[PDB]
Write a protein that binds this ligand. Structure first.
Ligand SMILES: Nc1ncnc2c1ncn2[C@@H]1O[C@H](COP(=O)(O)OP(=O)(O)OP(=O)(O)O)[C@@H](O)[C@H]1O
Ligand SMILES: Nc1ncnc2c1ncn2[C@@H]1O[C@H](COP(=O)(O)OP(=O)(O)OP(=O)(O)O)[C@@H](O)[C@H]1O
Ligand SMILES: Nc1ncnc2c1ncn2[C@@H]1O[C@H](COP(=O)(O)OP(=O)(O)OP(=O)(O)O)[C@@H](O)[C@H]1O
Ligand SMILES: [Mg+2]
Ligand SMILES: [Mg+2]
Ligand SMILES: [Mg+2]
Ligand SMILES: [Mg+2]
Ligand SMILES: [Mg+2]
Ligand SMILES: [Mg+2]
Lengths: 176, 176, 176
């Protein structure tokens, strides 16, 4: 049974021993990163024959987010338990940002093709998670690498969103 | 006219007499449960001929959430106004969890078919609402039955998500 | 390069000089309004030949939200920088609310056609943003016009959602 009922009174476990309330800043940060991941999976499902290229990196992004979630759930002082390192993932994001940035043609408004719009939604959820990650940071020591990655990731989603639009011959929505 | 303009200064009514600010913990909990409901409706709209079975329970889940919202909007001390009881709804969820759990084949990453992905998104929004419900709980007496149901509900959505994938011959996305 | 890396330590700029933490109430309000906008773009992408009429106003709503975001990012005391005025936008919303309100046939549950459901999701995200805008308001002076508009906007989305359902011959989901 996947339901233990240990959570039915509003408390839960993290990595290590601490029992925390579900509204605890750390539980929320791990939660928002998990919601971002759900949305990436949703976005990934909207891929078709014209946008097929975007599929593996999005899938890869989901792996990276799982790792981010793991480290957010891990207290820095914990003696028995951080697996996420930002350098390779972020550089990889930076390559795609520059790639997509030069391919594509005012301020840009979120929208366009359904995949582009979903990638624009990814951008804003990534940012919502980022604020919650900073909020944790202000109370507890966190893996700063997660924050570096998350910050770059919303930039990736802006870049990929524009590219998704470009891939289906769709103009970016512009502020008039 | 559906707009009274009574809210234009950031205040609103709940069940009973209290005028509360819209950022009040209770207004937020009622709000997050309402967003969950919107998303279930959205998820329900993605059903097609292969996933048609999932339709009634999702519809049923929306009824239950409306009730949850009602009780969250109701102060426990209020003399003129709780309608939600968890036993039958939660057992009903537990049956479907076990059903779906045995039908379907690493950690699972959210994604797959569009309906499966949406059910995975439902899971995380349910959890976001759950944290906001706990947050209310820590300041005010609430209907604990709502919390019991909500906690089980995200487990339902994990279970149904996997099943949605299974229904369309789609493998669960796995952590590599 | 769209990534400056100035944000990698959890801090960011607003309109004017203040460097703020990303979890700052003002950064969150600007963020939630930006997420609403993403979702409107997403909703707009779900339009087809039967719902084509809804397209321009949704597009127009995205312009208005960009302005809302701008003013939320602007401290009221700032000497070098408010562009949003609510009167024309809100009256325009009020016309569409009355229009759509008379066209369309219990409490209504969110859901129906995919576009209707998305407009129902828009409603709840608008409201989530509204609570975050009030939260800012309780600490800082804000452009009250933004709040007036946002409040009416979720009413617009309820109205348009029902109409989207009506446009595709779909009954509103009712609380049983
Ligand atoms: N509402 C929530 N939001 C975000 N993260 C959560 C939430 N609830 C639990 N978690 C985290 O996810 C892990 C697994 O979730 P799960 O729902 O199984 O925990 P639980 O609710 O405490 O137990 P149970 O659901 O079996 O009663 C938990 O150990 C906790 O760290
Ligand atoms: N931003 C919000 N988030 C969550 N719940 C809300 C929000 N605003 C209002 N509510 C709740 O939903 C109920 C109905 O919403 P409604 O928007 O009609 O209220 P209002 O904003 O106070 O009034 P009006 O919109 O007519 O000015 C309210 O009585 C309140 O309990
Ligand atoms: N996580 C966030 N949520 C909401 N709004 C944000 C967030 N981060 C930044 N902003 C706002 O959006 C503007 C542009 O975003 P951007 O991500 O470029 O800022 P940054 O993260 O500080 O810089 P960089 O991403 O280049 O390190 C910022 O000046 C800030 O006002
Ligand atoms: Mg569980
Ligand atoms: Mg940034
Ligand atoms: Mg109203
Ligand atoms: Mg749980
Ligand atoms: Mg940037
Ligand atoms: Mg209102």
């Amino acid at each position: 049974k996947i339901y233990t009922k240990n959570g039915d009174k509003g408390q839960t476990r993290i990595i290590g021993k601490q029992i925390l309330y579900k509204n605890d800043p750390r539980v929320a940060a791990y939660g928002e990163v998990n919601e971002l991941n759900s949305w990436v999976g949703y976005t990934k499902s909207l891929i078709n024959s014209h946008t097929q290229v975007l599929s593996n990196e999005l899938e890869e992004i989901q792996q990276l987010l799982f790792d981010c979630g793991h480290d957010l759930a891990t207290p820095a002082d914990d003696e028995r338990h951080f697996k996420f390192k930002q350098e390779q993932p972020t550089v990889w994001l930076e390559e795609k940002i520059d790639n997509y940035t030069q391919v594509v043609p005012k301020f840009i408004l979120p929208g366009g093709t359904q995949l582009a719009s979903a990638l624009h939604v990814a951008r804003t959820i990534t940012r919502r998670a980022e604020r919650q990650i900073v909020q944790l940071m202000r109370e507890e020591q966190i893996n700063q690498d997660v924050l570096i990655f998350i910050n770059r990731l919303s930039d990736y989603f802006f870049a990929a969103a524009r590219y998704a639009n470009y891939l289906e011959q769709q103009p970016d929505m512009l502020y008039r």
